[PDB]
Write an enzyme that holds these catalytic residues in place. Structure first.
Site, PDB file in Angstrom:
ATOM      1  N   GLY B   9      27.729  31.192  36.316  1.00  0.00           N
ATOM      2  CA  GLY B   9      28.760  32.213  36.338  1.00  0.00           C
ATOM      3  C   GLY B   9      29.119  32.867  37.663  1.00  0.00           C
ATOM      4  N   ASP B 117      35.120  41.611  36.629  1.00  0.00           N
ATOM      5  CA  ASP B 117      35.736  41.605  37.969  1.00  0.00           C
ATOM      6  C   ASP B 117      37.252  41.521  38.041  1.00  0.00           C
ATOM      7  OD1 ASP B 117      33.009  41.721  38.859  1.00  0.00           O
ATOM      8  OD2 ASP B 117      33.017  39.553  39.164  1.00  0.00           O
ATOM      9  N   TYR B 161      30.648  46.219  32.838  1.00  0.00           N
ATOM     10  CA  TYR B 161      29.493  45.348  32.563  1.00  0.00           C
ATOM     11  C   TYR B 161      28.126  45.824  32.996  1.00  0.00           C
ATOM     12  CZ  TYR B 161      30.400  43.056  37.259  1.00  0.00           C
ATOM     13  OH  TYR B 161      30.618  42.784  38.592  1.00  0.00           O
TER      14      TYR B 161
END
Lengths: 470, 466
Positions: B9, B117, B161
């Site tokens: 990721g 993001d 997150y």
């Protein structure tokens, strides 16, 4: 007859065969003619110079040598036995012959022995037989040259490969005097200029060395090499080498960035430099600036090549819409320019930021008009330039040529991540006369550069966040 | 039933298919069970989330999904539409369905939508239709979950997150309150702890977030991620997360170093941690490091004779990479907020030598001077251990491992060499007139980035490059 091209001669991850073949195509296209196989860490070239190639490795090399011949590129096979060869043992000399002879059976007619980056200490048995390190080198180099039928091109890389490495200087080196006297005259010698990574290679430094080695050297140029510093990359033009060297030289072979696709400028501009004075003897022929433009203009075309929803005025516009421009590449190159020089635009940003920081106090107290409207307008000019770095990154990250992107990613990421943080700090300097906020304990930044970075630092030289990593 | 494994990721050069297949083998061997495909810069996963895979790309993904099944690893296909998607447009939601249904035709039964993001700002058309960014996300996530038959494993990565990203804090975030209330309960939510790269993930930070999202999260762990700093690499053990989290969690998926082969320790020690309390007393980071390094060592002598006399030149290649070399390498490239014992030690000794440098630059204080000399010689020997480590690694038969790590090992040894040189020079100050650097590369170290970073608020050695 002049050897101009590329040497794959650096430390670290070597180039793979597909990339070498692609290199030959580029060399031919730009009218260069030579490749020198010398990857320090391809295991059978240096560490294990004794081992013969397997059947598969043999098949891959034959194919590669064929591809060189097909692209009208001279393939020079180098080998680097210097770390552990016993020079006086004829079984060792035979092993070296066996290796090189296996390679001639692959189709190769040009060769090299390299003795760069090894110590001067010989074993006991070699001192009984040779009076100096140079004698031992020259002996086996001559013996190998002759065994291979005195091939038209054979190269020798000395241990004293630059001005600074010559004890006690270039013109009185006993090591080089021996090389000049005893190394057979059909053999060519490699040289990197006044230093390992030479800022300039002046004509007299080449006359000086040409006299003690008794030929015109081939230059092994580390101008664009980037294996010595993890954060660096060089996209600026070939520079600091006068076109007047060409008649004083047997060739130039550039050893460039580890990341293959980063070498578009480095090799293209070398080719422009050579072509400019291909047939001179003993008026301004080559402009680094103009050659950079030529190369970036041509490099741009590769970014759109791999390797229809349209949102309304109210909807989210495409993140991906804008392609990489020529102005983005001129900027990228100015940020990752040359080993001793940032490009105009990067030097400028650095100079403006230094100025803003030292005049920071002007804006932290309470209105001094003429100094203040100077700071504000330079600070806004600087903020816009930091924005151009982020744009450059964003558009590159969207280009169709993923191979180029991946080779450069960590460099473009690093600069944009740091300009973003610098911009933030300039913004914060301009709020000091009303904001109480401080700038920023422990996120990534306290440990920047890792352990290496900590040692390096101790030597002599709806509300968007701040704590963003990505 | 707990998802433990790896998420690909990170930013940058993604892993290629051969490496992903090899990962599955490692996962199986260490008794982990999950891979999450999320490479930020594989172009069809995020930037161009709208494009369908070509025939070739499709063939490669079917093969890879088959390999996951063959290695008893759950393959989770993630997608990241958040940069670009107009959430209110049903043509956009359909495009997303088409994409994901092409992937289920490859054999995949598990999926994920990631909104990490990106900014909070919505387009004008989405604000007319949804009252907050969270509502829009949750809406299409629920719409997609249902369209795919409410699959057993479906993940959601929130924009908030981690603890620090929650406006105004974890427990009062309107963004997370909405996610907890409205996101269908069969869907799992990803979390990275108190920060992006969390030093610790304490039990209460997980109770706190579990209450506003109204389930136990899956952790997306960036402990070993190295995409955020070019010079860094993490070979230390899984650390700072108690075995007591396991019953409070639905899983842990580690997002590790970009360089594939560097992730032997990161993944092996995660697996030791999970196994220790599948159903801190049970797990020792130190002991887990030893287990992993002793097993990693065996790969160095495996790929992917002349015997010189007492007089003759000895083999440069003779000595293989040792366990002590890997313990040292890991201590130099340890964890994001901690150097390993041996590196912290070298740093502490060098700091001491530098600040007591004056003791040896004059001349009649004997006990402090024979202290400096013997600590300076002890330090010089340790710098020699780093060069040894480098030269033996550079000779190992596993070239694939070497290449992944080369520029890090080169950098540390090149800097220790220069540090050693400087300590030698400090011990000549009371007689040598020589200055340290008499430019060459060192004046420009780190490039332009390095010069900006320095201005933000907190055979000669120059001449030999190689």
């Amino acid at each position: 007859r002049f050897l101009c091209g590329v040497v794959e001669g650096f430390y670290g991850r070597p180039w793979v065969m597909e990339q070498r073949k692609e290199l030959f195509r580029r060399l031919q296209k730009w009218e260069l003619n030579t490749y020198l196989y010398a990857p320090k860490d391809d295991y059978k070239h240096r560490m294990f110079w004794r081992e013969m190639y397997s059947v598969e490795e043999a098949e891959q090399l034959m194919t590669l040598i064929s591809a060189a011949r097909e692209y009208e590129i001279e393939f020079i096979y180098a080998i680097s036995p210097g770390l552990d060869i016993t020079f006086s043992n004829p079984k060792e000399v035979s092993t070296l012959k066996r290796k090189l002879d296996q390679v001639s059976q692959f189709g190769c007619r040009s060769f090299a022995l390299l003795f760069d980056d090894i110590d001067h200490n010989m074993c006991a048995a070699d001192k009984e037989v040779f009076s100096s390190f140079a004698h031992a080198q020259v002996s086996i180099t001559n013996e190998i040259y002759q065994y291979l039928g005195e091939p038209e091109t054979f190269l020798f890389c000395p241990t004293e490969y630059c001005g600074t490495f010559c004890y006690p200087n270039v013109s009185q080196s006993p090591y080089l005097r021996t090389v000049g006297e005893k190394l057979l005259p059909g053999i060519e010698v490699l040289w990197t200029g006044p230093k390992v990574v030479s800022k300039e290679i002046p004509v007299e430094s080449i006359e000086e060395v040409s006299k003690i080695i008794k030929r015109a050297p081939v230059i092994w140029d580390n101008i664009h090499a980037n294996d010595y510093d993890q954060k660096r990359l060089f996209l600026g033009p070939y520079k600091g080498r006068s076109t007047e060297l060409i008649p004083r030289l047997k060739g130039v072979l550039t050893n460039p960035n580890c990341e293959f696709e980063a070498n578009y400028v480095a090799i293209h501009t070398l080719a422009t430099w050579y072509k400019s004075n291909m047939n001179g003897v003993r008026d301004v022929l080559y402009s680094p600036q103009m050659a950079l433009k030529l190369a970036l203009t041509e490099w741009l075309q590769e970014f759109g090549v791999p390797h229809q929803f349209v949102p309304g005025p109210n909807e989210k516009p495409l993140y991906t819409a804008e392609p990489v421009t020529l102005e983005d590449l001129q900027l990228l190159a100015d940020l990752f320019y040359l080993p001793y020089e940032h490009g105009p635009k990067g030097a400028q940003m650095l100079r403006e930021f230094q100025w803003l920081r030292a005049n920071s106090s002007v804006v932290s107290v309470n209105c001094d008009s003429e100094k203040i409207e100077e700071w504000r307008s330079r600070a806004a000019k600087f903020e816009e330039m930091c924005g151009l770095v982020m744009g450059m990154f964003t558009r590159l990250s969207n280009c169709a040529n993923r191979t180029i992107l991946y080779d450069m990613y960590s460099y473009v990421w690093d600069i944009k991540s740091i300009m973003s943080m610098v911009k933030s700090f300039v913004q914060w300097l301009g709020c000091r006369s009303h904001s109480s906020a401080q700038f920023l304990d422990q996120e990534p930044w306290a440990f920047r550069g890792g352990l290496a970075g900590e040692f390096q630092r101790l030597l002599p030289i709806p509300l968007t966040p701040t704590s963003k990593v990505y």
